[PDB]
Write a structure and sequence with these properties.
Chains A, B: This is Trichodiene synthase. The structure is a homodimer of 354-residue chains. In chain A, helix 10 packs antiparallel against helix 13. The first copy, chain A, is mostly helical and 354 residues long. In chain A, 67% of the residues lie in helices and 0% in strands. Chain A is globular, with a radius of gyration of 20 Å. Chains A and B meet through helix 7, helix 8, helix 9, helix 10 and helix 12 of A and helix 6, helix 7, helix 8, helix 9 and helix 11 of B. Bound molecules: magnesium ion (3 copies). One magnesium ion (MG) binds next to loops of chain B.
Chain lengths: 354, 354
């Protein structure tokens, strides 16, 4: 495990993309930018308000980068929802991403969680205070069922962050620990259920397909995120408790074996996704198919994952996979690779100062 | 439905009880009775109040049956917690059992769930109205972390029963559906986290053990019920949607293969429980140990699972598994079979009229 498994990585990646039919969409670069700028503009103004500014403990530059990555993720994956929906989901997912910067023990602020909740008093933990206060803007876009899924997944997310403050990969032999923790901090049900705005879908008529998407998208989403993150986290000694690293510690297997597990689950997850929704309702298969492709595009385009480093390395190779990878990467860059100066302005800090 | 695989039911059950070495020595007969009555008495008085009598929509006979089934469960498996704790947990778990067999559409009363929650206004769904109002009586026994696990899991459970109203067992090929639904309706984190009252355990000193216990117990717990309750659910209309029968529909495999899959999972779950916690804090191991064996005694004795019927049929068969089954069924009866007339009195209905 000295060096990075570039060959293995390339094969698994090209396979993943072939399985999901990664291809070109009717989502034009011009539309991309209208959305990116719309979501960013509404969010930046939100996070620039004094209340948000004083209760949300985050370094200004990290908040700026966090918002930009999230807006990119939302706009590129929730392609079929409205501009307002992308904006509101962008705010919510930025809140969640930001919570990972807190090192503060939740205990003291969670001692009266239920009582304050039941009584209607503002939560003690400032994050819950801002988040529950803003939640209605996100929930108005969905039916009661989908809404409940968003509420629960976020609640799970809070506990996940809590557990992670312990930097615990699991007890050797605790095979059920890794995936339990990945579901906690994954936001699977939040993501999967937020793909169905009531304005475009009927929660009740499409109940079976919506529940199914949630169940399948949960695992596909987090595993693809783990896979595409495997490169940036490979030599990062700061990142110590990923799904893959916990598989090593908990299951007592080699990092390679852990990676093997992730690839098999991801590929299988991919096959079944298609095999199940291809014949189902077309509007649904469309939302699903666009999420998978955009999600992948976002990973390939965002610098956070540094996948450009892999492209640049295998750029001129005659191996089959290396080439397939580069074509895919170029496909992505074409619609995805966009300068931040084109939408992400002005910085949140400039708006907060005003 | 078709025909109960009595032959296999014995085969799987026997392997489990043999592997965990089923042996319940949690209480002396006098102790069991002492606890059963205390728990039943407080819950019975609670459920007989006019408000509870009015908002909880359940046929008196069913309420009484569920209560006795739950007091037994709590007392037989939470053998190390206090009497008060057992009583309050018995109330919470009776609220859930009632819903577990229920048939209703949550939709209309879940439209304003979040807004009413955040505002502190009483929920529209009567079940939530009662469960949330009584919850503090349950949470007062635990620290903030465990409390959060109880709240999330109860919330998950609600969604689970909702998804079940649709009688959907998964789209053939939707391999992630079965276990997704099971965790959703299993109350795994609720059960697992309620095993640690702050009066006996320090949530912060044993954060890693408790979290691990929650992750591992979730599956052991639910799978064991999936196997033990396979008989009472097999032909019940309300239980056709189950992990076993959903594995069949979703993974396109025979009932025979579904049961084999379930038992292998359970055996492995049992093996890791031992590997991980055997050499840990003895107080933790004791609680886990008492829960496991007591939980099995409960399934073997309680009316809800009608396992006496299986006994009264194979007690004659000279099969090896049928013999192994009856020995176990007898061993459990010697400790768990206890006449309701010794603790379950007076009936809730009689207290309601008073
Ligand atoms: Mg159920
Ligand atoms: Mg049930
Ligand atoms: Mg069951």
């Amino acid at each position: 495990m000295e060096n990075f498994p570039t060959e293995y990585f390339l094969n698994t990646t090209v396979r993943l993309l072939e399985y999901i039919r990664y291809r070109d969409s009717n989502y034009t670069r011009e539309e991309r930018i209208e959305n990116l700028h719309y979501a960013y503009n509404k969010a930046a103004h939100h996070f620039a308000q004094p209340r948000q500014q004083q209760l949300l403990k985050v370094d200004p530059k990290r908040l700026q980068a966090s918002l930009q990555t999230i807006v990119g993720m939302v706009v590129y994956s929730w392609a079929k929802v409205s501009k307002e929906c992308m904006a509101d989901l962008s705010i919510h997912y930025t809140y969640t991403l930001v919570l990972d910067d807190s090192k503060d023990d939740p205990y003291p602020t969670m001692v009266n969680y239920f009582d304050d909740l039941q009584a209607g008093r503002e939560q003690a933990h400032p994050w819950w205070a801002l988040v529950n206060e803003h939640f209605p803007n996100v929930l108005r876009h969905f039916g009661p069922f989908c809404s409940l899924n968003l509420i629960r997944s976020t609640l799970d997310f809070f506990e996940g962050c809590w557990i992670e403050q312990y930097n615990f990969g699991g007890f050797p032999g605790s095979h059920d620990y890794p995936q339990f923790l990945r579901r906690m901090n994954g936001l699977g049900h939040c993501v999967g259920a937020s793909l169905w705005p009531k304005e475009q879908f009927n929660e009740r008529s499409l109940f079976l397909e919506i529940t199914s998407a949630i169940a399948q998208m949960e695992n596909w989403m987090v595993w693809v995120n783990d896979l595409m993150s495997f490169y940036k986290e490979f030599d990062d000694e700061r990142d110590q408790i990923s799904l893959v690293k916990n598989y090593v510690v908990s299951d007592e297997i080699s990092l390679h074996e852990a990676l093997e597990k992730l690839t098999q689950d991801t590929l299988h997850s991919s096959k079944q996704m298609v095999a199940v929704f291809s014949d189902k309702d077309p509007q649904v298969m469309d939302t699903i198919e666009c999420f998978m492709h955009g999600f992948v595009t976002w990973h390939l385009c965002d610098r956070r994952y540094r996948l450009s480093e892999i492209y640049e390395k295998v750029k001129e190779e005659k191996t089959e996979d290396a080439q397939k990878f580069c074509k895919f990467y170029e496909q992505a860059a074409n619609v995805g690779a966009v300068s931040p100066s084109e939408w992400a302005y002005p910085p949140v800090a400039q708006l907060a100062n005003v």
